[PDB]
Design a protein around this ligand. Structure first.
Ligand code: BLA
Ligand code: BLA
Lengths: 455, 473
């Protein structure tokens, strides 16, 4: 039921800032009940006097911003257009550092040097007590991979977390609204009145609201963890939530707007910088690589036909990919090399192969989670790779697999849930095989590219 | 073409607008700008061997000592208590140090246009945005952006200039105007500013690396003296103040932000600090728009691909099938005609040349450069006798279907277009070497060229084979 809470229409905001919803050919309609007080539906040309309405409205009408109360203070004006009406949020009220951190983020050589640099700067620009960089694995559980922190605050590096610490609907949001901050986690929520879209006749969609009332479930989270000031930035490699810059603080802390814009730009930089390294390991490997591969190709290219060619040098080509066993799978011809799974090799994997192929391949570390009955066969089938020969179908799919490996994984303790406390706790992990990056995959691809020459 | 020979990293001099120091590990300053006599009282032969701190403030002394600790600019050199600007680096094995004379509103202007380049939907909407922003912040009379071609010749593809400033837009430039070595370092030294071009260079004394047997490598120098030829160049062009930024898409010199000014003009560190970022942000978008278009070409190739799947499912000869779909799929990639070359069967669909298509193009095909393709925009160039059929075969694109023997070949043909390109020059008219005196645009109209294939159009053909294969199962 975790992916079921509707967080985007919460009908409230946070007390520190105040916001207004207006009718677009500008008159103002639906009000946040955080701002009527220290300053109901109303006509919009009716804001500070023409200085901050008019010039700021025309810039909003045609194509950030800086903004007369009884109390006479000064606010920050951020906005956006969404579900067809005009939003406007208000919160209370250097350059070298930013560029030099790009300049350092550009020279960083390894994926760790990229992140601990990323982690480094956005702490030095929010002062936050802890700035962790959080990569998602495929199952979208995570691991804090690098970390930069003030002393005396507990350290969470190399630490795995449930996928559940941020649920499914929460994640589209961070895939589309790329940044979020709550300064005090014990803010008493101040409602929006009404929560009626006057336009679409239903609750106030508060999606690109950065003042939005947040989940009490994740409020429960930070009174647990004991950090009362928190912000994050999501990391987007091609519309996919790759990971998160999760910032923390023992005490509440506000980061002002142009101060929060810099934080994000860093993540964007890492979003190529990672993509830089994603691709130069992708060609550092195809080289060594060719030297030995091309050899046992000409040894499989002793093709009067292939099995006497391949399986003669398969005991060599098996050693390439951690091939505990493999299988050839044509609908008619299934050929095993090495250690064999028998019947749901054919139907429960090839149908499993190209369906939701998505034109990309299928690889998995776990099978008892992707096909439940693989649990009995973990000793030879705990993890599986498969490459289509391509149309859906005949879709003749080749596949290599891996046995299970007993690794010990650390956790913010007991992933067994409501949660309570997150001290270090070990789980021995069964039914899991050891992974793949493309010095095996790009080998595997450059296997069947090479094979397909069997014309 | 000695152009590519002149050693430019060791001019033996720096520029007057600042002063430079060369120091070893323990701050024995080795060489110095010959205007340093006017700075501490000592003529240069006396600076030599002296220590750093004495030259300096007690404040500024320590603040460099810490910056050097980390195994990167900018400190301030208030040294005695006026304020200087400290850009440094290690190079050779010694630590260089260059010196320069003396928030928010600057920086809103940055993201306002950082996030502008993020929105840009075309290159030209992006580069009249890059060039626009560079100009808003370095106030240069003219801000051009320069595209490098395959030969390292170039083209002004966008431009922003204040009115009154004569325009070099859409103009081509020879590959000689930036010779080999300049590029070799513009790849690695991404920035250069020369603020006056009739400046009298301040030499460094000595011109010796004490570290090794060399003159002084002024590679990472912002202050290094440039070639006199490139100066006679810009007296000719009529712009007496210039700055360039290198636009690097992944360690290949892609192009250049070349700013110009009628009179001299200076850009402080911050000014061109933000500007190094603009070419950075821009080298990014170029790669996004590049690859975001590979997805919308992969888009419209959908409906008409589905066409020839149903046409090989029905006919099960792909030739019969695809060559029926021929009328459209060779418009998809704007090809004139194509041909399918199986070493056994050559079937020529639409417009195509005869018997030298076979061997003189499939033995030219891929050279067993397995990861490689083949193409041209002129074929009369490479098979000279193809000049005869240059009317139907001027450019070509051609995909293998295997490691040679089997050598299956698909190939797309494009005809000859009379396109008009123009430049300053006289690209043949390019004792010492000497730079051109006139830069008025001459037009040339080109014999035997196809339209430029893009990865845009290439990604099309690329997908075709990768489905023919899918089907053949
Ligand atoms: C299934 C419900 C949840 C469980 C269990 C849980 O632990 N949290 C749950 C719900 C939400 N989390 C929301 C935001 C959020 N969660 C995290 C989790 C982390 N913080 C960290 O510091 C680290 C790792 C170092 C993790 C994994 C983060 C970072 C965020 C974003 C905000 C922040 O910076 O803390 C969330 C959304 C609330 C809302 O937007 O209304 C929910 C519902
Ligand atoms: C055969 C010798 C040379 C001829 C002729 C010539 O024109 N240049 C020759 C050698 C060098 N050129 C150097 C630098 C340089 N050249 C250019 C060329 C252009 N500038 C433009 O604005 C445009 C078009 C709009 C072109 C085609 C540039 C940009 C530069 C760099 C400096 C700048 O921004 O003006 C050069 C290097 C000198 C040095 O810096 O050491 C040499 C040797």
């Amino acid at each position: 039921t975790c992916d079921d809470e509707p967080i985007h229409i919460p009908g409230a905001i946070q007390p520190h800032g105040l916001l207004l919803a207006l009718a677009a050919d500008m008159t103002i309609v639906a009000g946040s009940d955080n701002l009527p007080e220290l300053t109901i539906g109303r006509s919009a040309a009716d804001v500070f006097d023409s200085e901050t309405h008019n010039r700021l409205t025309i810039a909003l009408a045609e194509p950030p911003i800086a903004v007369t109360m009884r109390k006479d203070a000064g606010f920050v004006g951020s906005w956006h257009r969404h579900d067809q009406l005009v939003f406007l949020e208000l919160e209370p009220p250097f350059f070298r550092r930013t560029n030099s951190a790009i300049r350092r983020l550009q020279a960083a050589e390894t994926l760790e040097s990229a992140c601990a640099a990323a982690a480094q700067e956005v702490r030095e620009i929010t002062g936050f007590d802890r700035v962790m960089i959080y990569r998602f694995a495929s199952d979208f559980s995570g691991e804090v991979i690098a970390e930069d922190r003030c002393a005396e605050v507990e350290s969470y590096l190399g630490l795995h977390f449930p996928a559940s610490d941020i649920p499914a609907q929460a994640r589209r949001l961070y895939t589309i609204n790329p940044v979020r901050i709550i300064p005090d986690i014990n803010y008493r929520p101040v409602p929006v009145t009404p929560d009626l879209n006057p336009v679409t006749g239903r609750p106030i969609d508060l999606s690109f609201a950065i003042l939005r009332s947040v989940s009490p479930v994740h409020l429960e989270y930070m009174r647990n963890i004991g950090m009362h000031g928190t912000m994050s930035i999501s990391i987007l490699r091609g519309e996919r939530l790759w990971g998160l810059i999760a910032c923390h603080h023992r005490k509440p802390n506000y980061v002002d707007l142009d101060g929060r814009q810099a934080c994000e730009l860093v993540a964007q930089v890492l979003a190529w910088q990672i993509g830089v390294m994603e691709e130069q390991a992708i060609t550092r490997q195809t080289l060594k690589g060719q030297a030995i591969q091309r050899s046992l190709i000409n040894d499989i290219e002793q093709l009067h036909d292939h099995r006497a060619g391949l399986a003669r040098n398969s005991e060599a080509l098996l050693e390439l990919m951690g091939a505990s066993g493999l299988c050839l799978h044509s609908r008619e011809g299934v050929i095993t090399i090495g250690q064999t799974p028998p019947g749901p090799i054919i139907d429960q994997l090839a149908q499993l192969a190209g369906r939701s192929g998505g034109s990309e391949l299928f690889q998995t570390d776990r099978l008892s989670t992707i096909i439940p009955e693989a649990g009995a066969f973990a000793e030879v089938a705990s993890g599986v790779l498969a490459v289509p020969l391509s149309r859906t179908p005949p879709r003749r799919v080749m596949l290599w697999f891996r046995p299970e490996v007993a690794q010990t994984v650390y956790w913010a303790g007991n992933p067994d849930k409501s949660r309570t406390s997150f001290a270090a706790w070990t789980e021995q992990t069964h039914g899991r095989a050891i992974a793949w990056q493309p010095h095996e995959v790009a080998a595997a691809v450059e296997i069947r590219d090479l094979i397909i020459d069997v014309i």
